[PDB]
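Quick question: what would this complex look like in 3D?
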Amino acid sequence: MRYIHSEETIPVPENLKVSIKSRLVTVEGPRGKLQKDLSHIAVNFSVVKKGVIGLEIHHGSRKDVAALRTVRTIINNMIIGVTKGFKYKMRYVYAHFPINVNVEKNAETGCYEVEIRNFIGEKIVRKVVMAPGVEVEISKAQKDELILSGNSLEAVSQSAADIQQICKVRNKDIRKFLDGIYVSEKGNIVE
RNA sequence: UUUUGCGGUUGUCCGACCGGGCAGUGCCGCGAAGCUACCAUCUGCUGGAUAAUGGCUGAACGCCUCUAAGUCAGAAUCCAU
Ligand SMILES: [Mg+2]
Ligand SMILES: [Mg+2]
Ligand SMILES: [Mg+2]
Ligand SMILES: [Mg+2]
Ligand SMILES: [Mg+2]
Ligand SMILES: [Mg+2]
Ligand SMILES: [Mg+2]
Ligand SMILES: [Mg+2]
Ligand SMILES: [Mg+2]
């Protein structure tokens, strides 16, 4: 079965502008500007009301229609990141060896870099470089916590995933050795 | 080891000495050059794409989900240097 029409709508709040050209979505607001190339999906964009973007697929199958809500959610995520931002909080956990974390912004590039030392008591220092536009800081509110903030949820979550994956225990009972850096809270910078 | 280079030495022959011949390299010691020995010495690189897996975002399926669109990492693998 091919559905004649599949429709979805995105409301755009008053403080931001959205431009779609050749399926390249650009969202600009108070916190900055984001871009996303959606040319790999056959979707029809339009303006259905004063501040509502309609996106539809015509004569699509189940596989094609499954991407409509994905595109909506992605563009909505871009909008909320542009307006309120995204903030991930990670917690260090360990049994015996305190995990040492040092974060600094590069001079020659705008990216932040995080070095992890004393993981499970081994001498190798593991260095992970954040995606551009993502800021990392040591939490001043409470101990053993990292704060990653940014405009793009994809970049923020990918940097957090990189930090989480770089700290793994090998050839051990993972049910017993729980040491690592794990994302604890996902939210927005504002409110 | 035919450098038949030097020395020693058996038998025989050149009358003796000296210096040599022959015994298909007489035999023995040392023996440079050349060849040669994990029997000696020197030297043997890092980029990309991935598989299994671990993930991000995220529908299908108002929830979920590494997957369906997209995407990160990743093997003595594969393709290059
Ligand atoms: Mg064991
Ligand atoms: Mg000889
Ligand atoms: Mg001689
Ligand atoms: Mg003689
Ligand atoms: Mg004769
Ligand atoms: Mg003989
Ligand atoms: Mg010799
Ligand atoms: Mg998810
Ligand atoms: Mg895919």
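Answer marked as accepted. Helices of chain A lie at 62-83, 153-165.
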